[PDB]
RNA sequence: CCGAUAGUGAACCAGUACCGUGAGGGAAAGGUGAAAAGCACCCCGGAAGGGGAGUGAAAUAGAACCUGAAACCGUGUGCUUACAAGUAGUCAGAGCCCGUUAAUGGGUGAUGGCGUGCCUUUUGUAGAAUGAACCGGCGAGUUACGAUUUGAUGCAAGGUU
RNA sequence: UGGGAGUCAGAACAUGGGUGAUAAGGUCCGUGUUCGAAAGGGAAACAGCCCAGACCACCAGCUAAGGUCCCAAAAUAUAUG
RNA sequence: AUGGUAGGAGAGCGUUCUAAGGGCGUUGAAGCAUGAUCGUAAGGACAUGUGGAGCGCUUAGAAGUGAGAAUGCCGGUGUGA
């Protein structure tokens, strides 16, 4: 190959999910996590089990 | 005299020599259309469609097939988090009448 | 935007017109006169601007009502001070300024713009039967059934 | 004793209209000197 | 390698800016009250491409009954005579001749008459 | 031909200052000294020097005529604002405003 | 890699101004050189100007020579615009203009209809529910390192580091 | 079968039928309407009748209805009793 | 035939470097701030100012990556008589 023409195999790489970035990505505000209680917070949700 | 003919899904009134803009017609610029859906040509002698004339053509030639002004579609709602913003340019097309043909 | 025209001012002209009040319902011919005064029967009827022609009332003691509308009916205005409410039945206005019953008639059936407050003062009315308008030569109007 | 709502500078400029200064008076100085107070000996160059 | 903030934000609002240009007072000089003001006009905007079509062909109707009364026919009749004979034109159309060309509409006033 | 002059930081306020620059402004130069000579307002004098400061300018520099001369521009700019501390009430602010006087001067002429 | 809200609190007057009885707490402010050549000289008011003058390849490059930008705010000109009840816009047009990184280009400013936020939180709000001018450091998803589920292979009787 | 969730005031107007004080803008339940993201558009205007799910816009012009002095699409809208 | 604050697999841009290639540049080259183009983007190729020596494009990789509110903090500025 030549190293200007660099290309990865196909369905190999993917861009990360950022979250919290804006109201059209659909993950905009509250990020994911819903509206309240235990598992809204930072550090939260129950342990497993 | 001048006529009514009806292009695009609409309904228009022409004159001989006046410039016109139309749906986009499949025609290049240059050439000569024909429209032959005359509703009614009056001035003169007046004909009234049956619901068309059946003879009545009307000859036009095509400057500027063209694309028109932008417009901005934006919507939004209050407190929701959604709002699409969009872009539009419609296709036009001009034409100068030479001849209506009663 | 193609080919709808619209009137402007050096488009539009205005005739006068004069229709006679005696033996007609007050709000019959209230809507009539409202519609001429509007312009909606020119077909160069335009929304923004004023069309529509000046009218004449000339008869206006002999307007009439029917039922008991000369008892009851009764105009009420406020004015602002506080148990400050008037009143006056109908048939004591008709016999105590009757064009003032006339031009408030039609001028409620107008709208409250500044268009229609101009529109409103194409309004002439008289109680009985001479008008000093001979000069704008008025044409005599009768009453669409 | 406080605005609910800030003013604008078309409020602010609407009431500054009044507020202003009159032009003054100007009887001026025949014998010598500069222009003195309208019906004063006024105290710089005063020849009325 | 810290990426700063700059420049980005300020033609992001700079052109909101510009949109809101002819707007009274602070609409057209502060970002957040020009912001919404912009998003409502476009709104409004959506809307009133609707609602012109209504318009004008309520304005088109009105001229149609004025000229159809000065030859004793509603519009509803001249619309209903009109539609048995055959005729197939626009209100647009009909509104343009009743002002322009009144012997020709006149024409078809008659047609609408006697196919009742 | 224009002269102008600017004074710079003249510790006046400047809406006190632009009160009486309405009055000069747009008349001729020796009207204007007399309406600045009859006014007591602080900023007076101030406006006076600047005034005569751009009259010598036209006379020495660009050889004008000074009794043809009309007042074409007379404004105030702001400066920087210094900041006090009032110790005289309960710790509140106190800025110094202060203004730059700008005249210029001309025969009307091109 | 820190590229200077920085490995530093501090690449400047820094554990200093300042604050506290004391233990202690703890800033702001950084930035020629092309060469001071820093307006001799000279002319009108102290400051500040106007001229010339200059090392000035360029001082609206004058001590704010790191230049140096924006916005808020200004302020002085003007083009169009003055019978009223207002989520100020939007959709329907007389006067005045005139065209780049070029072609229903570029516009500017007057009228009749219709008219509720980043927002948040709510069954439901637009506040008589909450919180709010401009700019920005400048402000909210690694691995020690594991587990489990979705490309290429030594390369498949096969697994090594 | 496996990956990733939100939701558990989940309600509020609507009965169907019913309990309980027949208000409850309180308790069950059987469909509806919104729904929240479906905003809207003709039920004064109202994620609580007619209509909609979305290619999506757009001067298509012509339909669904709930419709038809002035507002303000749209019967001055009549004719008959 | 083609809506969803929670959902999956999507094509893209500001900072940096490789890891490159190829350019604009000390008869000027910027960038940045004022200009008609591109646009849903985020983000870049030709008139003023700037200077007066710094940037783009293409492909790929890495993120002090990622800018209207938090009675947010302030280098902070400036308003409201």
């Given at each position: 190959?030549?190293?200007?023409?660099?290309?990865?195999?196909?369905?190999?790489?993917?861009?990360?999910?950022?979250?919290?970035?804006?109201?059209?990505?659909?993950?905009?505000?509250?990020?994911?996590?819903?509206?309240?209680?235990?598992?809204?917070?930072?550090?939260?949700?129950v342990?497993?089990? | 005299?001048f006529?009514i003919?009806?292009?695009?899904?609409?309904?228009?009134?022409?004159?001989?020599?006046q410039?016109?803009?139309?749906?986009?017609?499949?025609?290049?610029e240059?050439?000569?259309?024909?429209?032959?859906?005359?509703?009614?040509?009056?001035?003169?002698?007046?004909?009234?469609?049956?619901?068309?004339?059946?003879?009545?053509?009307?000859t036009?030639?095509?400057?500027?097939?063209?694309?028109?002004?932008?417009?901005?579609?934006?919507?939004?709602?209050?407190?929701?988090?959604?709002?699409?913003?969009?872009?539009?340019?419609?296709?036009?097309?001009?034409?100068?009448?030479?001849?209506?043909?009663? | 935007?193609r080919?709808?025209?619209?009137?402007?001012?050096?488009?539009?002209?205005?005739?006068?017109?004069?229709?006679?009040?005696?033996?007609?319902?007050?709000?019959?011919?209230?809507?009539?006169?409202?519609?001429?005064?509007?312009?909606?029967?020119?077909?160069?009827?335009?929304?923004?601007?004023?069309?529509?022609?000046?009218?004449?009332?000339?008869?206006?003691?002999?307007?009439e009502?029917?039922?008991?509308?000369?008892?009851?009916?009764?105009?009420?205005?406020?004015?602002?001070?506080?148990?400050?409410?008037?009143?006056?039945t109908?048939?004591?206005?008709?016999?105590?300024?009757p064009?003032?019953?006339?031009?408030?008639?039609?001028?409620?059936?107008l709208?409250?713009?500044?268009?229609?407050?101009?529109?409103?003062?194409k309004?002439?009315?008289?109680?009985?039967?001479?008008?000093?308008?001979?000069?704008?030569?008025?044409?005599?109007?009768?009453?669409?059934? | 004793?406080?605005?609910?709502?800030?003013?604008?500078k078309?409020?602010?400029?609407?009431?500054?209209?009044?507020?202003?200064?009159?032009?003054?008076?100007?009887?001026?100085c025949?014998?010598?000197?500069?222009?003195?107070?309208?019906?004063?000996?006024?105290?710089?160059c005063?020849?009325? | 390698?810290?990426?700063?903030?700059?420049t980005?934000?300020?033609?992001?609002?700079?052109?909101?800016?510009?949109?809101?240009?002819?707007?009274?007072?602070?609409?057209?000089?502060?970002?957040?009250?020009?912001?919404?003001?912009?998003?409502?006009?476009?709104?409004?905007?959506?809307?009133?491409?609707?609602?012109?079509?209504?318009?004008?062909?309520?304005?088109?109707?009105?001229?149609?009954?004025?000229?159809?009364?000065?030859?004793?026919?509603?519009?509803?009749?001249?619309?209903?005579?009109?539609?048995?004979?055959?005729?197939?034109?626009?209100?647009?159309?009909?509104?343009?001749?009743?002002?322009?060309?009144?012997?020709?509409?006149?024409?078809?006033?008659?047609?609408?008459?006697?196919?009742? | 031909?224009?002269?102008?002059?600017?004074?710079?930081?003249?510790?006046?306020?400047?809406?006190?200052?632009?009160?009486?620059?309405?009055?000069?402004?747009g008349?001729?130069?020796?009207?204007?000294?007399?309406?600045?000579?009859?006014?007591?307002?602080?900023?007076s004098?101030?406006?006076?020097?600047?005034?005569?400061?751009?009259?010598?300018?036209?006379?020495?520099?660009?050889?004008?005529?000074?009794?043809?001369?009309?007042?074409?521009?007379?404004?105030?700019?702001?400066?920087?604002?210094?900041?006090?501390?009032?110790?005289?009430?309960?710790?509140?602010?106190?800025?110094?405003?202060?203004?730059?006087?700008?005249?210029?001067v001309?025969?009307?002429?091109?």
């Amino acid at each position: 190959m030549k190293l200007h023409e660099l290309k990865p195999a196909e369905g190999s790489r993917k861009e990360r999910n950022r979250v919290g970035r804006g109201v059209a990505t659909g993950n905009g505000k509250t990020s994911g996590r819903g509206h309240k209680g235990q598992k809204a917070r930072s550090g939260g949700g129950v342990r497993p089990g | 005299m001048f006529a009514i003919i009806e292009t695009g899904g609409k309904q228009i009134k022409v004159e001989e020599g006046q410039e016109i803009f139309v749906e986009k017609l499949d025609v290049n610029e240059g050439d000569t259309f024909t429209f032959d859906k005359v509703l009614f040509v009056g001035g003169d002698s007046v004909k009234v469609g049956a619901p068309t004339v059946e003879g009545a053509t009307v000859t036009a030639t095509v400057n500027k097939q063209g694309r028109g002004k932008k417009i901005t579609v934006f919507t939004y709602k209050r407190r929701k988090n959604s709002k699409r913003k969009k872009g539009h340019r419609q296709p036009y097309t001009k034409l100068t009448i030479d001849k209506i043909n009663a | 935007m193609r080919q709808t025209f619209m009137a402007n001012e050096s488009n539009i002209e205005r005739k006068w017109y004069v229709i006679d009040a005696e033996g007609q319902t007050l709000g019959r011919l209230s809507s009539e006169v409202a519609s001429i005064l509007r312009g909606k029967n020119k077909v160069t009827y335009t929304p923004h601007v004023d069309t529509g022609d000046y009218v004449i009332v000339i008869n206006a003691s002999k307007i009439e009502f029917t039922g008991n509308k000369e008892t009851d009916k009764v105009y009420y205005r406020h004015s602002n001070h506080p148990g400050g409410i008037k009143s006056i039945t109908a048939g004591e206005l008709r016999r105590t300024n009757p064009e003032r019953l006339i031009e408030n008639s039609i001028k409620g059936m107008l709208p409250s713009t500044r268009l229609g407050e101009k529109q409103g003062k194409k309004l002439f009315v008289y109680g009985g039967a001479e008008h000093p308008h001979a000069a704008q030569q008025p044409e005599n109007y009768e009453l669409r059934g | 004793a406080v605005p609910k709502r800030r003013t604008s500078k078309t409020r602010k400029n609407k009431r500054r209209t009044h507020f202003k200064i009159s032009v003054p008076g100007m009887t001026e100085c025949p014998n010598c000197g500069e222009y003195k107070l309208s019906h004063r000996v006024c105290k710089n160059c005063g020849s009325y | 390698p810290r990426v700063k903030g700059g420049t980005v934000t300020r033609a992001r609002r700079k052109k909101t800016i510009k949109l809101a240009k002819g707007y009274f007072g602070s609409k057209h000089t502060l970002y957040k009250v020009a912001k919404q003001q912009v998003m409502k006009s476009g709104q409004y905007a959506f809307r009133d491409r609707r609602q012109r079509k209504r318009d004008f062909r309520k304005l088109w109707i009105t001229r149609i009954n004025a000229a159809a009364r000065q030859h004793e026919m509603s519009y509803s009749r001249l619309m209903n005579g009109l539609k048995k004979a055959g005729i197939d034109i626009n209100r647009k159309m009909l509104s343009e001749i009743a002002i322009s060309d009144e012997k020709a509409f006149a024409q078809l006033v008659t047609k609408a008459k006697d196919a009742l | 031909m224009e002269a102008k002059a600017v004074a710079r930081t003249i510790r006046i306020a400047p809406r006190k200052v632009r009160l009486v620059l309405d009055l000069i402004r747009g008349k001729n130069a020796a009207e204007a000294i007399a309406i600045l000579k009859l006014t007591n307002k602080a900023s007076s004098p101030v406006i006076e020097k600047v005034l005569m400061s751009a009259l010598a300018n036209a006379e020495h520099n660009y050889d004008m005529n000074t009794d043809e001369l009309v007042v074409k521009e007379a404004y105030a700019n702001e400066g920087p604002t210094l900041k006090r501390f009032r110790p005289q009430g309960r710790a509140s602010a106190i800025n110094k405003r202060t203004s730059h006087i700008t005249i210029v001067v001309s025969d009307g002429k091109e």
